[PDB]
Design an enzyme around this catalytic site. Structure first.
Site, PDB file in Angstrom:
ATOM      1  N   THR A   1       0.984  -1.254  -0.028  1.00  0.00           N
ATOM      2  CA  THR A   1      -0.023  -0.009   0.192  1.00  0.00           C
ATOM      3  C   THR A   1       0.663   1.244   0.040  1.00  0.00           C
ATOM      4  N   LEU A   2       2.023   1.187   0.571  1.00  0.00           N
ATOM      5  CA  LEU A   2       3.040   2.352   0.864  1.00  0.00           C
ATOM      6  C   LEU A   2       4.289   2.112  -0.062  1.00  0.00           C
ATOM      7  CD1 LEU A   2       2.987   5.173   2.343  1.00  0.00           C
ATOM      8  CD2 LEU A   2       4.409   3.839   4.178  1.00  0.00           C
TER       9      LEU A   2
ATOM     10  N   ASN F 103      -1.099  -1.698   6.933  1.00  0.00           N
ATOM     11  CA  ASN F 103       0.112  -1.857   6.387  1.00  0.00           C
ATOM     12  C   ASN F 103       1.122  -0.597   6.378  1.00  0.00           C
ATOM     13  OD1 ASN F 103      -0.814  -0.881   4.035  1.00  0.00           O
ATOM     14  ND2 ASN F 103      -0.219  -2.642   2.910  1.00  0.00           N
TER      15      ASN F 103
END
Ligand SMILES: *C(=O)[C@H]1N[C@@](C)(CO)[C@](O)([C@H](Cc2ccc(F)cc2F)NC(=O)[C@H](Cc2ccc(F)cc2)NC(=O)[C@@H](CC(=O)N(CC)CC)NC(=O)CCCCC)O[C@H]1C
Lengths: 230, 212, 208, 210, 211, 204, 195, 195, 204
Positions: A1-2, F103
């Site tokens: 996601t990052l 996350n």
């Protein structure tokens, strides 16, 4: 996601006579560590459709739960074989998901291939479906087949051969040099092995322990993994 | 730290006449320095007498074209008549400005024929401004072709002048322009679709360009 | 940085005839001009011309450096200087300040002499801001308005051509290119050199 | 470069026709004046999409107000509405620059509106890159009680000279005239080329030097 | 831009495209990436073309002076040493990656130079934007001790594969064959509206006849 | 931090260091060894223990059925036949879901260990982000496990005894402690079998 | 910040500039003399920018030109003066920059009455007319409007009066006091204006 | 940027401010009216800053005070007006800031003639005299020098004339035109001054 | 990049990978294996070869004295008794000086190997910056050597044979190639002895 952490390498998908052929190396690299050398990177949604993967593994797993459970909902509201959803349906679904996540800015660090057979006039597998547990091949017209692509940015298209990752330079060149129409299984597997050999010899993140899957009139066939001849 | 904007690259050419409109576009998709596929039409038919072309992000133009076709079909269902090209132009203007602060990477051209048999051509920016024209181009090659169209159509900085123009000469001029763009720009393409609109419906042809 | 004093230059070839052209603008703070006579073309030798486009101070400084080197070369050798020698020397000068360079994208236009009588071969070439030479053999364009000029020339170039048709071609290409650039224009000049003579003409452009 | 001033026979509004994506012009012909009402116009400057969308939205709201109340709106109210809605989008990226001018029950009125909610009433305004040049030429040669012909000539020359020292401004001049019973378009569109070679270079010999 | 090199039976074959770009546009459609160092050494590279031109001229003329002083055949390792010192001294900012090839007394040997001053002798390589497309088919088809014709055909396989694939590469394909005695430079190897008089307006004219 | 897990015959082992109790008892037949940030790991350990108690209560059927120092503790299972103990695939996959949905903040690599009737001894490796892989041979995590990756690859056998895996995992963590700088203290080891779990620590 | 205006025509030249010594938010004076630099012969140099930069550059250029004229016993040409000033400004720009605008003017037997614009990055070119500073925006179009060939000095001063009235009325720094410098008929006349 | 001056003594109050509508480098007008906000009753609000901020804040405060007076049928006290304006400014400062200065003034039966300084960060306190903007530096010491108890309105206007002369002469923005607002003997007189 | 050096009986061995010829011959009795940046390492290799030729010429006395595929090459020493070959301590310490004076730019870990009469087989490890340590047991560098650190520690013996060190170093680099991602190609190995040096490569 990052950002990507655990990454797969690349996949190749080509259509030929009797179905299509999709191949992938069974490895997921933790940067420059190669933690996992036995990972299932080609998934199945239903008969006559599969999902490719080259990128972050968590996003592919999340998309695998979404796609396979969309197939579960399809089966739970099924009355005839034609009611089964085609690869165009799933490819559009993944494209819309990637577009929405782009607009939200929470993308998936993946490059997906959706491919299979968008026709039901060739086999009677879907009339009585078998999820858990499981003749001669019937030649399939290329128009009835389908291979698609989905980018991080949601970009999508369709072609007779689609590759992701570093295979978009090596294997795409070999395919554009050599890909014919209605090649047999042996010629297709030779071409895939040559492309993956060139990738193994010039890609760190790739490997030789290859998975090969086919989507034919008989259905999705996960063959035995093999080390490349080299 | 992810930028949600990539120029897939391309060009769309448009030209008008007394009772017709010619719109042409590539059939190449690409990335920065590599090509995905050799066949990706950017022109989407909207109505019987209107089409839309675009350039920029492939996903954005696909979503925009399918959304606009949804709105047009809902309009025909609710109102029992097809929308005019000016109606579609204002609708696309409002759609583009709705995402003002996360704009579509889509430079659009809207071609068609009005109810009075007049070939119109609207040209857009990313945000929503639009103005009718007799010639326009968008995409990577826009700076290349736009002076050429100004020389041919407007034909300023000339004294002898020649306004005698017909459909075949305009089509051939568009073929010359897109070929010159293909020679002189890397993102342009390898096969192009020359959409032609007339009072007697729509016709579409295809042409083969350089593969480099 | 090239938006500050935007400019454009152009040069074509033909049948025993060569053309060079430029805009006459001098900018300041991009979107306000201050002069309509700043010629980017500078005569340097009886059959060599150079078109400098970019920052005005760098244009002038490079003109005096090259004029110094040129007039030194004709005075020592006591003979007229060649286009290729000037092109190589220009490339060396632009490279000599590889770091902190002159912000100018020049071109070179002239004639090549082949003695035996004598034959005048056309010669054209272009440079980056370092001296990335590239022989072209046809139309050569350089500046902020380079893309529009590249678009115009291929539609309008007719291979070898008469000097009158060459003047019409290069004039229409430059005028159509400059009209589509906001920071480039304000008149034009077209120099058409031949072995017999040179014709210098100014165009009734959209200077406003 | 937009322009607006007030005189004996109403208001004169003048604009250019250029449109820039930076160093490259998108289109040489556009329309920067919108009939917001039958008796009210509004110029356009800065971000094209922003100003166009918001004057059309203001025209919508004006149609609502007139149709409900059965009374023509004033320019002050439209300017206040515009400045209020634009202030809601403060610190977002809008660059709307507007001059609203028209006739109402109070009389001939003129307002300037900006993206920052900058409602300012006056009798002479100009917004754009070439605003300073037009302001200079008007304030050198603007007077009350001069004829309509002199007014259109002054506005045309001011727009010309603003285009002369501004690459951003150019194209064609569109001089409109507002009076009691609506408005008329004195100059729908006139090229600046022949305008230059009439005004500054009447003789077509040698390049003009400045 | 696409460049390649190859070692063959007692020879070396280089190859490159004929196109240069000034951003998303193309300036020259028939450029010449191949450059002459010596009678038995040639080069071609990708990067800032001004850096390539100046560094190649410097290497060419320095090799000529070294040959004239020593009166011995030029060597490829010497050219590698001069290039590596030149790029290492200037901190790697001179981005010019060069494919060096030649045939010295120690037989044919191809070299690949990088921006930061490193080098490595290889049997084959490719550099530029379209490097990968070319050098994939090179390693697909490369063999030891080819004939010269097979080498040239493979070089058109690489550079013609990169022209069709890569957007930053295109045009004609150049080939040069380097040998212990003599060389060959095949520049075009494969190769895969009038206005009336007085149309434009003017406002000035001045004819100056030339003496 | 070093974390090692090895599957041997009729059982499974886990190990850690003691430097900053990294093994945590979710359930009798289910132990998890934590690596990464202490706070993130402890929060998800509280949440996953909550979820395990929830499903362990929920899956219960209605009626009657089935009519140096090596100081060690032994804990026989209360539930024979694994009637209501949850499955380690389930707990590992909800853990994957929790790390994936968060996350952007959660940064912790967890390796799971337990015995199930359906699939016998298992070993799941939850990585950074929401990536889960079932390791049939062995699993590794932490900084100190980086150095013993080839040692484990060399000395691992397919069907190892309890004593073989004991000595191998003990020497593995000892070599990781010796090489790696941020690992030390007494070694903790947990052996999970079909019918019991035994916790024993090593002070060497 | 510091407004400079210049006009040139047949048989006259005019320069002009505000008389203000700005420091922070105040004025040290309303009768500045640091902007104009009279050169020996029919020449002048008008500078605008920071006070110290124009002081150092103007004194350096003036005293070097004086050195040239005394050593050589001849009046320096105006074109030589302008291009020498440009070369010095460009050289100092590359090393130790002088943020200072310029307006070179003078009279020559061979070229006549002539003027030269020049920016702080040495962006130099001959012009019939020009201006500097933020006030260049509000006076240059006036100069385009009311300039014509065969002008006279009185018409030029009327144009300058219009420009000063505009700068007082409309420009943010409502500049009132100005100093002029007229060159005509081999004289150098200076005037002070307060609109 | 926008100069505001205020003075308060026994049986008078004076406010003052320049009349200028600045946009970029020019003036939209020399006769601004967006700075003063007359309140019903013997009250006023003088604002300085960006035009839109003072327009929104002044209209909002004025029309809410009018709402209070109409609902309650009584004249709002000056102290209540000042502290209500401060609370609104502080609340908007914490969320959607209004870069705008203030000078609240009025007359009350219980407190008499009184004035309140207030900054853009709602730094509010009663004062006999104060100023805002960069011109506050060049006029506040004059106000200290020539203010004394038992002053008159004419002496105050003389002090304001001195401050305007100083702002014209020495302050960088040589502000010429000003508007005044005098409160005395249950009247509200407005004047326009051009020094 | 993986780099390994091992001292065994009457000799010394070195190893590398082939991915980006990392071993470089400074002299007949002196070989060096390069790790880190290619350009930095190659520049200092040119300079240290220059210095070795300089001292090798300089220390010469005046007159007469002393009256898969395992494809291999052997190079007997020209200089018997090590009369004028320089000392590996000297070349390693000037290398330390060169890296230290330019440590702001130079980033390369070099490990040296050679035989000297004074101190027999030696192995010097030049690290990042100007740090030099003489390793009597073994030396390691590169990314791929990180994973085989415990394997080498376990399987090293004090006085190993040539075949033992051959198999150990070959399996070491093979495991590093298998684990590490940025190492591959044919393995190169160089054995340096009292009276000869033999170069042999492995393609497996
Ligand atoms: C007078 O001074 C004059 N100057 C210009 C011409 C300068 O650009 C302009 O400001 C003009 C306004 C305009 C243009 C066309 C139109 F139909 C109506 C209209 F009001 N300004 C512009 O065109 C924009 C420049 C700009 C200024 C300030 C900003 F903060 C941002 C941009 N350019 C555009 O609007 C452009 C695309 C765009 O929206 N951008 C730039 C990428 C901002 C997101 N759109 C067009 O040019 C027209 C549609 C495309 C046609 C193919 O007007 C007066 C003041």
């Amino acid at each position: 996601t990052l950002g990507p952490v655990v990454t797969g390498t690349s996949v190749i998908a080509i259509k030929y006579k009797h179905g299509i052929m999709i191949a992938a190396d069974r490895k997921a690299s933790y940067g420059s560590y190669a933690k996992f050398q036995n990972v299932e990177r080609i998934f199945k949604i239903n008969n006559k459709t599969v999902m490719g993967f080259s990128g972050e593994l968590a996003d592919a797993q999340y998309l695998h739960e979404l796609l396979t459970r969309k197939n579960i909902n399809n089966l739970s509201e099924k009355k005839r074989k034609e009611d089964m959803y085609t690869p165009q349906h799933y490819h559009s679904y993944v494209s819309r998901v990637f577009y929405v996540r782009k607009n939200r800015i929470d993308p998936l660090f993946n490059n997906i291939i959706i491919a299979g057979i968008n026709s039901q006039k060739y086999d009677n597998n879907d009339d009585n479906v078998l999820l858990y547990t499981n003749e001669e091949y019937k030649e399939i017209h290329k128009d009835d087949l389908y291979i698609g692509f989905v980018d991080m940015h949601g970009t999508n298209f369709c072609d007779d051969y689609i590759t992701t990752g570093y295979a978009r330079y090596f294997a795409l060149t070999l395919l554009r040099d050599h890909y014919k129409d209605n090649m047999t299984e042996e010629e297709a597997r030779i071409l895939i092995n040559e492309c993956l050999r060139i990738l193994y010899f010039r890609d760190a993140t790739s490997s030789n322990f290859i998975q090969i899957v086919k989507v034919t009139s008989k259905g999705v066939e996960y063959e035995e993994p093999y080390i490349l001849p080299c | 730290r992810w930028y949600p904007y990539i120029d897939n690259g391309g060009t769309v050419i448009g030209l008008t006449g007394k009772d017709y409109v010619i719109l042409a576009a590539d059939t190449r998709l690409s990335l920065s320095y590599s090509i995905y596929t050799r066949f990706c039409p950017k022109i989407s038919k909207l109505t019987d007498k209107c089409i839309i072309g675009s350039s920029g992000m492939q996903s954005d133009i696909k979503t925009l074209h399918s959304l606009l076709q949804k709105k047009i079909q809902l309009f025909v269902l609710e109102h029992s008549h097809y929308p005019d090209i000016h109606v579609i132009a204002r609708l696309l203007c409002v759609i583009l400005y709705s995402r003002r602060f996360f704009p579509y990477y889509a430079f659009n051209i809207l071609a068609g024929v009005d109810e009075n048999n007049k070939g119109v051509l609207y040209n857009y920016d990313s945000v929503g401004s639009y103005c009718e024209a007799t010639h326009s181009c968008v995409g990577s090659g826009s700076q290349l072709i736009l002076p050429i169209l100004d020389n041919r159509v407007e034909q300023k900085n000339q004294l002898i002048k020649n306004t005698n123009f017909n459909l075949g000469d305009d089509i051939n001029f568009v073929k010359d322009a897109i070929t010159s763009a293909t020679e002189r720009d890397i993102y342009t393409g390898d096969k192009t679709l020359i959409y032609v609109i007339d009072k007697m419906g729509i016709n579409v042809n295809t042409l083969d360009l350089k593969q480099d | 940085i090239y938006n500050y004093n935007g400019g454009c230059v152009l040069g074509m070839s033909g049948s025993n005839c060569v053309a060079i052209a430029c805009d006459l603008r001098l900018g300041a703070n991009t979107f306000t001009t201050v002069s309509t006579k700043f010629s980017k073309i500078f005569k340097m030798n009886n059959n060599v011309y150079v078109g400098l486009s970019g920052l005005a101070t760098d244009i002038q400084t490079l003109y005096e450096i090259l004029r110094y080197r040129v007039n030194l070369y004709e005075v020592r050798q006591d003979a007229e200087m060649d286009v290729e020698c000037f092109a190589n020397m220009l490339s060396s000068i632009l490279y000599s300040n590889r770091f902190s360079p002159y912000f100018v994208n020049p071109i070179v236009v002239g004639f090549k002499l082949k003695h035996y009588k004598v034959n005048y071969e056309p010669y054209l070439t272009a440079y980056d801001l370092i001296g990335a030479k590239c022989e072209t053999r046809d139309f050569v364009v350089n500046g902020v308005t380079s893309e529009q000029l590249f678009g115009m020339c291929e539609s309008l170039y007719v291979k070898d051509q008469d000097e009158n048709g060459l003047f019409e071609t290069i004039s229409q290409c430059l005028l159509s290119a400059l009209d589509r650039d906001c920071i480039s224009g304000w008149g034009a000049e077209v120099l058409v050199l031949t072995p017999e003579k040179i014709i210098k003409k100014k165009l009734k452009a959209r200077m406003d | 470069t937009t322009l607006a001033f007030k005189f004996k026979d109403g208001i004169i509004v003048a604009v250019d026709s250029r449109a820039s994506m930076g160093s490259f012009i998108s289109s040489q012909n556009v329309e920067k004046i919108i009939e917001i009402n039958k008796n009210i116009l509004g110029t356009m400057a800065g971000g094209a999409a922003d100003c166009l969308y918001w004057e059309k939205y203001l025209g919508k709201i004006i149609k609502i107000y007139e149709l409900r109340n059965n009374e023509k709106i004033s320019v002050r109210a439209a300017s206040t509405i515009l400045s209020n809605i634009l202030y809601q989008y403060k610190g977002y990226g809008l660059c709307c620059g507007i001059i609203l001018s028209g006739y109402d029950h109070t009389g001939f009125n003129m307002f300037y509106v900006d993206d920052s909610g900058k409602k300012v009433e006056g009798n002479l305004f100009s917004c754009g890159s070439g605003s300073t040049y037009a302001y200079s030429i008007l304030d050198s040669a603007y007077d009350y009680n001069l004829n309509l012909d002199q007014a259109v000539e002054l506005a045309r020359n001011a727009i010309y000279h603003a285009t002369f020292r501004d690459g951003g401004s150019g194209g064609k001049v569109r001089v409109f005239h507002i009076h009691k019973n609506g408005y008329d378009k004195i100059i729908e569109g006139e090229d600046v080329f022949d305008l230059h070679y009439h005004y500054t270079n009447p003789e077509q010999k040698d390049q003009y030097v400045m | 831009t696409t460049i390649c090199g190859l070692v063959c039976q007692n020879a070396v074959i280089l190859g490159a495209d004929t196109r240069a770009t000034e951003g998303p546009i193309v300036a020259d459609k028939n450029c010449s990436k191949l450059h002459y160092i010596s009678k038995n050494i040639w080069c071609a590279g990708a990067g800032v073309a001004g850096d390539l031109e100046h560094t190649t001229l410097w290497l060419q003329h320095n090799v000529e002076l070294h040959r004239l002083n020593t009166n011995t055949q030029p060597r490829v390792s010497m050219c590698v040493s001069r290039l590596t010192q030149e790029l290492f001294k200037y901190q790697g900012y001179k981005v010019c990656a060069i494919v060096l090839g030649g045939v010295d007394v120690n037989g044919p040997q191809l070299y690949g130079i990088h921006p930061h001053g490193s080098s490595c002798l290889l049997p084959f390589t490719a550099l530029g934007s379209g490097s990968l497309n070319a050098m994939a088919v090179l390693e697909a088809k490369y063999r030891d001790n080819m004939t010269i014709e097979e080498g040239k055909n493979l070089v058109c396989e690489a550079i013609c594969a990169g022209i069709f694939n890569d957007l930053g590469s295109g045009g004609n394909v150049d080939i040069c064959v380097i040998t212990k005695d003599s060389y060959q430079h095949i520049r075009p190897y494969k190769e895969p509206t009038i206005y009336p008089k007085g149309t434009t307006p003017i406002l000035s004219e001045k004819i100056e006849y030339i003496k | 931090t070093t974390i090692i897990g090895i599957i041997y015959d009729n059982g499974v082992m886990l190990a850690c260091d003691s430097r900053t109790r990294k093994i945590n008892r979710i359930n009798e037949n289910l132990y998890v060894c934590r690596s990464g940030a202490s706070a993130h790991s402890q929060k998800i350990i509280e949440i996953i223990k909550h979820y395990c108690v929830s499903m362990k209560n929920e899956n219960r059927k209605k009626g009657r059925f089935h009519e140096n120092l090596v100081t060690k503790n032994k804990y026989f299972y209360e539930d024979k036949f694994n009637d209501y103990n949850p499955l380690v695939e389930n707990v590992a996959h909800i853990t994957k879901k929790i790390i994936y949905t968060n996350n952007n903040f959660l940064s912790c690599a967890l390796i799971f260990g337990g015995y199930d009737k359906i699939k016998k001894q298992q070993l799941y490796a939850v990585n950074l982000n929401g990536s889960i892989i079932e390791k049939h041979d062995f699993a590794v995590s932490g900084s100190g496990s980086i150095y013993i990756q080839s040692y484990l690859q060399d000395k691992y056998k397919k069907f190892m005894t309890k004593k073989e895996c004991f000595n191998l995992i003990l020497n593995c963590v000892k070599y990781a402690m010796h090489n790696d700088n941020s690992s030390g203290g007494l070694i903790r080891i947990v052996n999970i079998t079909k019918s019991f779990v035994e916790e024993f620590t090593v002070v060497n | 910040m510091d407004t400079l205006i210049g006009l040139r025509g047949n048989n006259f030249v005019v320069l002009a500039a505000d008389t203000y010594s700005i420091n922070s938010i105040i004025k040290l004076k309303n009768d500045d003399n640091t902007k104009f630099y009279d050169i020996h012969g029919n020449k002048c140099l008008l500078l605008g920018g920071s006070i110290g930069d124009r002081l150092q550059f103007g004194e350096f250029i003036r005293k070097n030109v004086h050195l040239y004229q005394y050593q050589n016993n001849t009046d320096m040409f105006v074109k030589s003066f302008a291009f020498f000033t440009r070369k010095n400004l460009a050289y100092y720009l590359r090393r130790n920059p002088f943020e200072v605008n310029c307006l070179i003017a003078g009279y020559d037997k061979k070229d006549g009455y002539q003027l030269y614009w020049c920016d702080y990055l040495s962006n130099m070119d001959s012009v019939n007319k020009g201006a500097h500073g933020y006030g260049a925006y509000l006076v240059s179009a006036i100069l385009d409007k009311y300039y014509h060939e065969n002008l006279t000095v009185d018409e030029a001063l009327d144009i300058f009066k219009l420009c000063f009235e505009e700068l007082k009325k409309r420009f943010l720094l409502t500049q009132i006091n100005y100093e002029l410098r007229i060159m005509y008929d081999n004289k150098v006349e200076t005037q002070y204006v307060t609109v």
